[PDB]
Design a protein around this ligand. Structure first.
Ligand SMILES: CC(C)CCC[C@@H](C)[C@H]1CC[C@H]2[C@@H]3CC=C4C[C@@H](O)CC[C@]4(C)[C@H]3CC[C@]12C
Ligand SMILES: CC(C)CCC[C@@H](C)[C@H]1CC[C@H]2[C@@H]3CC=C4C[C@@H](O)CC[C@]4(C)[C@H]3CC[C@]12C
Ligand SMILES: CC(C)CCC[C@@H](C)[C@H]1CC[C@H]2[C@@H]3CC=C4C[C@@H](O)CC[C@]4(C)[C@H]3CC[C@]12C
Ligand SMILES: CC(C)CCC[C@@H](C)[C@H]1CC[C@H]2[C@@H]3CC=C4C[C@@H](O)CC[C@]4(C)[C@H]3CC[C@]12C
Ligand SMILES: *[C@@H]1O[C@H](CO)[C@@H](O)[C@H](O)[C@H]1NC(C)=O
Ligand SMILES: *[C@@H]1O[C@H](CO)[C@@H](O)[C@H](O)[C@H]1NC(C)=O
Lengths: 486, 486
């Protein structure tokens, strides 16, 4: 019946198999370049060409990441009011490549003198490159996600759900490629060759759109709507009556989806802190060697999470697209976010248990292992015991990560698409920054949880339990908000 | 509108304030007597009048508890087919008082010779008394709960929801009275006076119904329905067609509510194990003294849980009857069970954290404290640190315990009321027994979690984490079952 019809829709892609693979490949290459920059920025800045202090490099990376979140709302508005999505993404990719071209030249010893030969050694060029890269990334992220789902939007709302699966899969495949191959070359072979590859990736990602301009679905720009709902918004949030035709409906949609985005700040707060502290714990756990180029990169550890995601996304798809559809289970995009939050809390609890075990074991004996150029003191507890953690968050990223994008896409006005995604990725950055502040809070002398690269004297288990409690409170609040919204 | 109407219904009781207080008082007295028997049965059996071994007394108490669960389905059937609820409860209370009269006589030194003067010293009389008490308790429990809600059933389904709140409140008040006063006298003053009081409670509970026979709502017995849906059930589970008039509907209801009861076995499995191991942990924690009669009873520790429940039930009622009704939040009786399971899992995790802290602290120093007539080795960690546990389960008993009874009452055929409650209380016993088996499982030499009254050498934290995992899996399964049922 209806189920049969929906399963038949799941039979999507179909005609448009080109228009999609192009977007998937473009996002893969863009993510590969982004992770190539982000993985080893601090090592590059604190090295031979640049004599920046560790604090300066950390602040530079923090500003670069913050720019990629702050520029998203403005990148989305530019792609809706003044330009189309295709042209905006093309301009953003051109700017991203321009910012890309700076780092290989600085890495090269011959061309470094031309740029900055004659505190910070080469602050202007590096800052300009980082600003350009951040603006390009912010404009691409806020615009590629709705542009890709535009091709599959005609076949109802299950084709856009299948597309957002292989979009996340391509993102994670690009992350694996960048953090595995490029991050290895950047630290073992040379920085020139390690930074030339992501530039070539950006160059190839630009060619794909030019080749695929004949198969994409475009929408004419419309800034009149933005003017109507920004300039004369203060004149009113509802009850337009005879004045205005249906723009009051999209004003209602905006003011109704803002609270859902606001209630998701603690989710990102916990999620980014889990990204950081999980790697912190992995560094202090027994890591086996691979050979008899040395000192495997620390970025490889992050790969672990994404390594799960790939193996889950096909499987899940099959074992979720029939199984959960013919039974009418979990159809909405908000209950899936709730399930993701539940599994985030479970992962936090598992991490706390493992950290308590590690802190109990470390009092007996400790070994030294080198990662990069620094030796960490680790207990004699195998790294693979951290596998149960990464499953639970991985399942979370199966549910909460994709469903968040689906909700941001579907529950948004047609005119302001790619601008609601801008707010989504901006509130993600706000959550990341408040999470950094939370980490700074528990590090004070009054609490002393994170008073000290060795964490054998820091109670990471209490931090994990606090994150679990925050995630539980967020789960309850989000359940209430989702019920009220529906 | 509709909300207003429902809030007005909440304005219940109203006319029937007598018919209810009578049921509440009867259940209070019955629970006081039951907890008077259960609290100190082992101490009585292993003492001066009786020279039973500890294993024999434990087996006797286990059989007594198992009888109270096994007799529930048959007690409910007797109250529906052959008798009315009022007459069945009166007969059960008479039998309960008859079984009650045995223990004071055995405790008294003069009358002990008349009963058993001339292995187990007085097995026949004690076994007969325990059998009579168990049958009486089983028949009362399966019949008092639907009889009490019968008075308030006319004013829609919010009066039966308010009644089931003050019913649980009266149960917990009776538990506090029995475990605080009676359990104190049974161990400090004398067993004769400590067992005379619950007999007087049973006697008073019998008088209340005789006084309230003029204000109760009764239903004529109907065994023809039981014959129709038992004897010729094998002839068919649906599609009756011209044969039968609407009994196929109640057959459908039975076969549709059986899976929900089956999926609740792990809930009771975890809940009873939490009842036991929480007291086990409380015994090994620093307990302050009260005076300068000595050796406060161990049963007082159980009081802790119920001590919360009282303070929650009024408050909750108010802060849930307006607040959660005008907002249309959590109206069904199964989502409340799901919330209770969530809080059970959270309590298990908190208990595991506290147990890990206690096991870390015990390695430094240990103190000795006497409870009853046995000294426990306890860490120097305050007992009140166990408060966060008992809140989380207490909230659970606010949601899962009451809503389970509401679902058992509402989702049941009109003819088989008090027989579905029999199955409810029987599956509760099945869950209790499988929980006892689970505790016996983790005590084997292969696992060794509970290899040994001192638990300083037993990993209770791993047991708590296993209970939390079981509760999470039960939460997921129950969510799926509840969605399919609705
Ligand atoms: C006892 C004190 C702590 C009050 C507890 C309130 C919390 C525990 C309970 C009470 C009200 C509940 C919410 C009421 C609103 C809904 C909508 C319901 O359809 C799905 C669950 C959800 C999201 C509930 C989540 C849990 C909840 C927030
Ligand atoms: C979703 C939430 C409720 C999960 C519960 C996690 C929190 C509330 C629980 C888990 C472990 C619990 C702790 C268990 C052990 C200790 C150590 C003791 O020295 C003080 C109490 C304290 C600190 C408890 C505080 C509350 C606690 C931290
Ligand atoms: C609802 C469920 C999933 C909650 C998760 C609880 C379980 C699955 C988690 C919580 C703590 C985790 C443990 C953390 C620490 C250890 C000790 C180590 O020597 C073996 C792995 C092991 C044993 C992990 C096994 C999985 C684990 C027990
Ligand atoms: C990835 C693997 C572990 C599959 C995971 C399945 C579990 C995690 C998910 C998938 C399907 C989900 C259930 C689908 C059915 C429903 C009905 C929905 O309206 C409420 C939630 C509930 C009860 C979901 C609970 C969580 C659930 C059981
Ligand atoms: C660990 O490092 C410390 C500091 O250099 C050193 O003294 C100690 O011997 C090292 N242990 C091992 C096993 O290398
Ligand atoms: C605890 O009990 C043991 C065994 O009787 C005893 O030897 C020890 O001294 C006791 N400790 C205290 C503080 O009483």
């Amino acid at each position: 019946r209806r189920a049969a019809a929906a399963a038949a829709a799941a039979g999507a892609f179909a005609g448009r198999r080109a228009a999609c693979g192009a977007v998937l490949l473009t996002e893969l290459l863009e993510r590969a370049a982004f992770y190539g920059i982000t993985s080893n920025l601090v090592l590059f800045l604190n090295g031979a060409p640049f004599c920046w202090e560790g604090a300066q490099a950390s602040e530079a990376l923090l500003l670069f990441m913050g720019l990629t979140y702050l520029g998203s709302p403005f990148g989305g508005w530019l792609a809706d009011a003044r330009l189309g999505r295709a042209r905006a993404i093309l301009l953003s990719l051109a700017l991203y490549l321009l910012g890309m071209l700076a780092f290989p030249l600085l890495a090269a010893p011959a061309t470094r003198a031309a740029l900055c030969g004659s505190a910070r050694c080469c602050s202007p060029a590096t800052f300009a490159g980082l600003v350009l890269v951040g603006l390009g990334v912010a404009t691409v992220k806020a615009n590629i996600t709705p542009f890709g789902a535009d091709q599959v939007k005609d076949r109802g709302p299950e084709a856009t759900r299948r597309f957002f699966n292989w979009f996340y899969w391509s993102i994670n495949l690009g992350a694996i490629l960048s953090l595995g191959g490029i991050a290895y070359i950047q630290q073992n072979v040379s920085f020139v060759t390690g930074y030339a590859i992501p530039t070539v990736c950006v160059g190839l990602a630009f060619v794909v759109f030019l080749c695929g301009q004949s198969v994409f679905i475009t929408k004419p720009p419309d800034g009149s709507a933005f003017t109507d709902m920004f300039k004369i918004l203060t004149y009113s949030m509802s009850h337009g009556g005879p004045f205005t035709e249906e723009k009051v409906e999209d004003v209602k949609a905006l003011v109704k989806i803002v609270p859902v985005f606001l209630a998701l700040i603690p989710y990102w707060t916990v999620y980014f802190q889990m990204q950081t502290t999980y790697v912190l714990q992995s560094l202090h756990l027994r890591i086996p060697e691979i050979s008899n180029p040395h000192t495997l990169p620390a970025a490889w550890l992050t790969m672990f999470d994404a390594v799960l995601i790939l193996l889950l996304i096909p499987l899940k798809d099959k074992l979720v697209d029939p199984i959960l559809r013919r039974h009418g289970l979990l159809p909405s995009s908000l209950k899936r976010i709730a399930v993701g939050m539940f599994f985030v809390m479970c992962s936090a609890f598992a991490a706390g248990i493992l950290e308590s075990k590690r802190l109990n074991l470390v009092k007996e004996k400790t070994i030294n292992q080198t990662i990069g150029n620094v030796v960490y003191h680790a207990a004699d507890l195998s790294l693979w015991w951290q596998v149960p953690q990464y499953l639970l968050i991985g399942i979370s990223e199966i549910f909460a990560s994709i469903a968040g994008l689906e909700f941001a896409y579907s529950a948004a006005p047609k005119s302001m698409q790619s601008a609601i995604m801008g707010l989504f990725f901006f509130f993600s950055g706000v959550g990341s920054f408040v999470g950094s502040g939370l980490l700074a809070l528990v590090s004070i002398k009054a609490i002393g949880w994170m008073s000290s690269g060795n964490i054998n004297g820091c109670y990471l288990n209490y931090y994990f339990f606090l994150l679990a409690a925050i995630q539980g409170a967020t789960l309850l609040l989000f359940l209430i908000i989702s019920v009220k919204y529906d």
